[PDB]
Amino acid sequence: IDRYEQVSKDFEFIKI
Amino acid sequence: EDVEIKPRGYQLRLVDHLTKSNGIVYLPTGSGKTFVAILVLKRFSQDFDKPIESGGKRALFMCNTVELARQQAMAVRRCTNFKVGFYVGEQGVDDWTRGMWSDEIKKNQVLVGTAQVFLDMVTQTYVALSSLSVVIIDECHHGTGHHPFREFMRLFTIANQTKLPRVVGLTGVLIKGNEITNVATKLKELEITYRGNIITVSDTKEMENVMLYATKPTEVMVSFPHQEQVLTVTRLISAEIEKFYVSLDLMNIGVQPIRRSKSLQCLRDPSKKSFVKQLFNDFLYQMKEYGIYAASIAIISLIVEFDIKRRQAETLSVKLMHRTALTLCEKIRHLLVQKLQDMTYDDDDDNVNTEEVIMNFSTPKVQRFLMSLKVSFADKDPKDICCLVFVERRYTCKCIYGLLLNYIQSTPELRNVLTPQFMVGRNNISPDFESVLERKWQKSAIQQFRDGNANLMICSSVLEEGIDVQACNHVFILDPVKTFNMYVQSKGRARTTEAKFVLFTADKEREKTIQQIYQYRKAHNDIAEYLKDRVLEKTEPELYEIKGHFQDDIDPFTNENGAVLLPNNALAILHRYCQTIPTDAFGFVIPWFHVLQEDERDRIFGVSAKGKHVISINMPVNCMLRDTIYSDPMDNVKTAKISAAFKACKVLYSLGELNERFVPKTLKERVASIADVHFEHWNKYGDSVTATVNKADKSKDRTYKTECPLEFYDALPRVGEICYAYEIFLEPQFESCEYTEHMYLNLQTPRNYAILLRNKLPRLAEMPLFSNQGKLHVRVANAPLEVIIQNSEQLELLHQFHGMVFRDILKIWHPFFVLDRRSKENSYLVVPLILGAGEQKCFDWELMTNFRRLPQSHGSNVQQREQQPAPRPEDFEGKIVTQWYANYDKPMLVTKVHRELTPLSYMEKNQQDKTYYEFTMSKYGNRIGDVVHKDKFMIEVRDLTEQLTFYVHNRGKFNAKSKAKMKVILIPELCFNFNFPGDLWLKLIFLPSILNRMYFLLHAEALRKRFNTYLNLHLLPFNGTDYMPRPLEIDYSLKRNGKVKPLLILQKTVSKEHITPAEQGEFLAAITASSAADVFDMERLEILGNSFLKLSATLYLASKYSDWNEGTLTEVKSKLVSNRNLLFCLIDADIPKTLNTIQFTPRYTWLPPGISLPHNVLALWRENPEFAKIIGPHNLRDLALGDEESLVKGNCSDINYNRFVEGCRANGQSFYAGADFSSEVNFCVGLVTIPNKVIADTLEALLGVIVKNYGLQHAFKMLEYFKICRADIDKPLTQLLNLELGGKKMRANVNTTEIDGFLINHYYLEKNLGYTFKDRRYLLQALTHPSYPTNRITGSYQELEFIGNAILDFLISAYIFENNTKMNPGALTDLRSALVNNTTLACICVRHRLHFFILAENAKLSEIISKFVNFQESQGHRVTNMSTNVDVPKALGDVLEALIAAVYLDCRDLQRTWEVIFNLFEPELQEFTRKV
RNA sequence: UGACUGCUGAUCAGCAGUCACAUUGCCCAAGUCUCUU
RNA sequence: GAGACUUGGGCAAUGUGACUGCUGAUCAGCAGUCA
Ligand SMILES: Nc1ncnc2c1ncn2[C@@H]1O[C@H](COP(=O)(O)OP(=O)(O)O)[C@@H](O)[C@H]1O
Ligand SMILES: [Mg+2]
């Protein structure tokens, strides 16, 4: 792959 | 400070519950349960002040870790008035004794420490369970199974059930692990193990709401996508690590210890080879988990740790391994950072560019973590942040700490707000990112967090319990939750309001985390329901179930005296004992276990043993348990190991290794039993051998009361009684010349003087005496002429003549001297004699009746001189005169007269142009006027010498002044003449120099007779009545003014017919201390006495104890030959008062025999020693007693006594108030001070003189006389002959030709040793180093070297005494110490190539010997004699020392031992005997 | 349909072994500093 | 000799995770035999 997949610029701190 | 610490309601309820009965408190963390424990401790203060023996109890407080213990100790110290103790294993409690233990327990009302230490100190009966009031434990959830908390709780049942102390536990989480299913069984287990119910708050309206100020956090979970593919760099690095690991096993190093799995079933790898594998396997995990940047950071840590290990590598092989590891690590780092630097240029914001590339080169988990960090703190004030980070691996803490540092520095906003820090468990990681020891740190990370110096705190699973930290408002977890207890603790860290609890999970593993977190929550809810809704049960003190929970273990063995050994503590106890075995560095301090297969199980043990396992223990060879201990047939291998260790420990205690309290004993405890066995005589002096304070006065000297020999005590002749007189002859021993006739002719005159005693005298030796003009030898008549005093007046006149001799004719007199009339010590007499009828010699009666008082040389003027009768030459021939007109002091012997010379005649010399008459008138005629006779005879005269101690041997011709002195010629009528016979004066000038030597030859002969009679050899024709004394010997060795030659002492040892009589002079030599400065000294026998005493003590200890280790035997042996012990065992024998130490100057340091102090003065002196010690020579010299009282009355006048007492009392406050005078006035009162060193020296001198003549065997009887080696009365002959023929036991009853396997090619050893062993057990036992597990049929070398040292030392000392007869003893001791040096032994061992055949398994010492032998070969087996090699290996000299004793014990022939010792010492002995 | 075997999978419990990780403790001994022979 | 801290080694203890071996139970199916 030679690189890391850039994760989404945004994500949710979901409440359990 | 307690008023502001006012308790809350729930705390009161909890304390009230825990006081009534034992229980386990359960509240969420931060509720103040430790404060509850403080109050509980306060509730038992009713008996904390009373001492233990009076019924006082001490509080006990114990915690699982040292940090929690320290924090709670500080808290209780500040919050209580009790003196808080501290009892931990990190403060050095290992080597405590009962003293400080008892005083610490007495002084500290509350005790704090770890678990194992408290277990040890309660098992060893320092304090009983009945001696405590309340015991408080914390974090009880660790205390299950075999944890020390459970073991401590077990002791409550085994002890007195009544009056049992209260116990309560502290915990916030009650169950540890993922087995939380069916919480009821674990709740019951914890409530029964600690014999107490679990309690919790039960009404949310008033308790839970109030305590919930420790508010629960808010759960937050962030998901990240999985890793879709792996990179090229990771797999390339792993491929390199593959061949790295391959070469690691390919890399061959020295022998290493053997490690196997915990069940002893699989073969493991050495720890030093597996640490690198563990490090690289953690690095690979870091790479695969946290990203390539994390690996770039962590390879630096690998560099750091590998560099530290390479610096600290003991052996070159370890250094090579760590160097290869460092090279591979550096290659990995370069290859990894190449990729980073190939893309750290994507944009022009330099440091923000670094931030962006870190974001790019980070795994989705760490990427999400970084985004959470950025968006969480909102770039607020740095003091507004309180966050914690938990990761599993220890190295992950430092890795993510470095990543956070770099990223924060790379952030524009977070740079000014965030500062990271990392800590790990107690196995701390090197915090530096560069070379070791950057700086001396002084502030702990926990202290940084508490002080507010940091807001982020990276940590492993070390930060859940114990550490007191402020309530964080953020918690982040980077790795999935593993255990329920860790979850509860980590979520309990976030205690303040609005706290953030964040945990990270992967996408497709999100649901598993969801289910596990709800199971944890449901388990907590079920625990709460169980506690709240349970039946109203009591404390549950059900003994049946309590016992039913415990019996599964082996029954705890308690011995007598109340001590107890826990089977679960058996491994620790046994290993602690085994480490105490003496070693080099390692010495195999671990017991080698071995499990047995089923065939052995049903071969040895019962029919039941097919399934149950059996394990065998092999104790190290340096332990007397040479056999093996078999384990009980047990269910599983772990309990089988426990049983084996427990039984081995019980056997070891049965053999006395473990003490009364199950702790292994050391030299301090070993010598305690032997104290009253060999050192009982110290008790009569009060002190003891174990009393180290008794050595505080080692260097000081001691005083003694001297006494004359029995031949002199009460030897005064009495009127009308049989009295014997001994004629003294002073034979010249030189060629007479013109400078010697004046004394040569007079001394050989038939007239002489005799010493007269009522008692009889034994035959005495011939003395050497050195006059300044010739050599003199003096003899005493064997047959004493006997006369009986028929007239008391004759005896009186003899007595005043004897007094006048010392008073005037030698001027050996003081004004305080008084004629000793009484018959007492030294009260003999000196009598002049003249020829009688035929060979018979009688009294020179006219001589004594004429010279009662010395004539006075009156100065006569010519007016007076002209009316006295004219001089007539025969009246002056052979007389003594004095040149009064020139100097009224000099005596002057008239050797001849010049009847052909007149005063008118010309002077012979120095005024040859002029005459005697006018010469006298020139200088002396002014005061004397004219002279009567101008034409009469002249007299040529010679002067007497003024020397007084004729012991020194220097000689020479005084040609500068003798020619002028021998020509001295005087006028007859001018110089006053005493008309005294010059021969008699010329003989008595030497008299004190003879009397002093006889006064000690009598002692020597009387001691020799006693020693011979005790040995029962006095009946032999060479001794007893038929003994012929021999003349003394001059010591020219001193400077102070083919086949080996058989050794004489050993030659006479085997053959009793080679004995020779003991000489009186040889005893006198050992009597005369070197301080007295005689022609011969005692130091020559002292070294052999020391050698023989050490040899005999060593052999006696070896025969007495063949089981104890060499260390205690060596220290006891050194204690036996200690000079203080020799002092204490020689004082009883009454030897010191017989010695010769002081100088002999009669004018100032010697007391005349027949003259002493006044009787009343002596009575006063000896009545009050305190009053006597403050009297100096001047005080005695103050008076000048008249003739009557001093001579005839033999006392002092009453007014004279008054002047003595008044002067002494005045001097009590005079300038000399408090000064010491005993250093010079003791010689007049028969007292002397002798160094204890001299006492030990003379003890050894007597032993040496006995040994060198009577053989080794007889001297052992003399050691019995000195009660050193107490005789075993059952078998006394073992102290006589078996001392050199003993030392072995039944160990030789087992044998096989298998020994040749251990002795690989020992034929070369025989060839290069010369000796041919009859038994090979001795050689094998000598060659086995204690670090050797391969062999068990034999023993170690220690208990052979113990004897070999003594044997080699004794033979070397005997040889140097015999052959080296021309060199000083002061250098002889140095030569002996050089011949016994360990480096010389190592050189001898390696020269003959004895290093090959040593049996040892220890890599470091093996490499030491390897680096030694090559250097020695480079020296060509010729050590400069010491060579500055790396380090001498003690073992090389040790094995030679052991082989010496093995060779001796093989044949018991000391001659063979001397032969082999000489064969191995020939070149070194020849070199050293030439130069020390 | 029952009895029973053979095959095989799944769930669950228990024991034992291997490998790795985490925390806690004792012991021996070394280094330097200070007290100090 | 002692106190502070660091270095170094050995053993014991708690818990999780992974793989294997074995026993017991439960569920299910197939194939084969009898009733
Ligand atoms: N009733 C109280 N009175 C005064 N201070 C209290 C009280 N309860 C708790 N505290 C304080 O709160 C802190 C709680 O810390 P700690 O005792 O470690 O909690 P826990 O033992 O529940 O983990 C203590 O330092 C204590 O000083
Ligand atoms: Mg706390």
PDB file of C-alpha atoms (C1' of nucleotides) in Angstrom, chain B residues 144 146-147 176-179 259 262 271-272 309 312 483 590 638, chain D residues 2-17:
ATOM      1  CA  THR B 144      -6.437 -14.242  46.626  1.00  0.00           C
ATOM      2  CA  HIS B 146      -1.195 -17.523  46.965  1.00  0.00           C
ATOM      3  CA  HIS B 147      -0.898 -13.757  47.406  1.00  0.00           C
ATOM      4  CA  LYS B 176     -10.080  -9.075  39.600  1.00  0.00           C
ATOM      5  CA  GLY B 177     -10.248 -10.656  36.159  1.00  0.00           C
ATOM      6  CA  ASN B 178     -12.725 -11.605  33.452  1.00  0.00           C
ATOM      7  CA  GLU B 179     -14.249 -14.475  35.484  1.00  0.00           C
ATOM      8  CA  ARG B 259      16.257 -22.251  31.939  1.00  0.00           C
ATOM      9  CA  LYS B 262       7.323 -23.133  34.531  1.00  0.00           C
ATOM     10  CA  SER B 271      17.720 -14.741  29.697  1.00  0.00           C
ATOM     11  CA  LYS B 272      20.593 -12.745  28.188  1.00  0.00           C
ATOM     12  CA  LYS B 309      23.678  -3.011  28.083  1.00  0.00           C
ATOM     13  CA  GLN B 312      27.385  -2.779  31.305  1.00  0.00           C
ATOM     14  CA  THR B 483      -9.905  -6.794  32.757  1.00  0.00           C
ATOM     15  CA  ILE B 590      19.576 -22.081  42.932  1.00  0.00           C
ATOM     16  CA  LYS B 638       3.152 -26.887  40.945  1.00  0.00           C
TER      17      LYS B 638
ATOM     18  C1'   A D   2      26.047   3.219  58.468  1.00  0.00           C
ATOM     19  C1'   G D   3      22.215   6.575  55.633  1.00  0.00           C
ATOM     20  C1'   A D   4      20.239   8.280  50.383  1.00  0.00           C
ATOM     21  C1'   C D   5      19.751   7.065  45.354  1.00  0.00           C
ATOM     22  C1'   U D   6      21.035   4.558  40.956  1.00  0.00           C
ATOM     23  C1'   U D   7      23.253   0.070  38.591  1.00  0.00           C
ATOM     24  C1'   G D   8      23.001  -5.670  38.280  1.00  0.00           C
ATOM     25  C1'   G D   9      21.120 -10.651  39.210  1.00  0.00           C
ATOM     26  C1'   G D  10      17.690 -14.553  41.131  1.00  0.00           C
ATOM     27  C1'   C D  11      13.013 -16.332  43.023  1.00  0.00           C
ATOM     28  C1'   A D  12       8.006 -16.034  44.455  1.00  0.00           C
ATOM     29  C1'   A D  13       2.903 -13.794  43.710  1.00  0.00           C
ATOM     30  C1'   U D  14      -1.862 -11.669  40.893  1.00  0.00           C
ATOM     31  C1'   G D  15      -4.415 -11.218  36.143  1.00  0.00           C
ATOM     32  C1'   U D  16      -5.410 -11.088  30.873  1.00  0.00           C
ATOM     33  C1'   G D  17      -4.725 -12.709  25.981  1.00  0.00           C
TER      34        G D  17
END
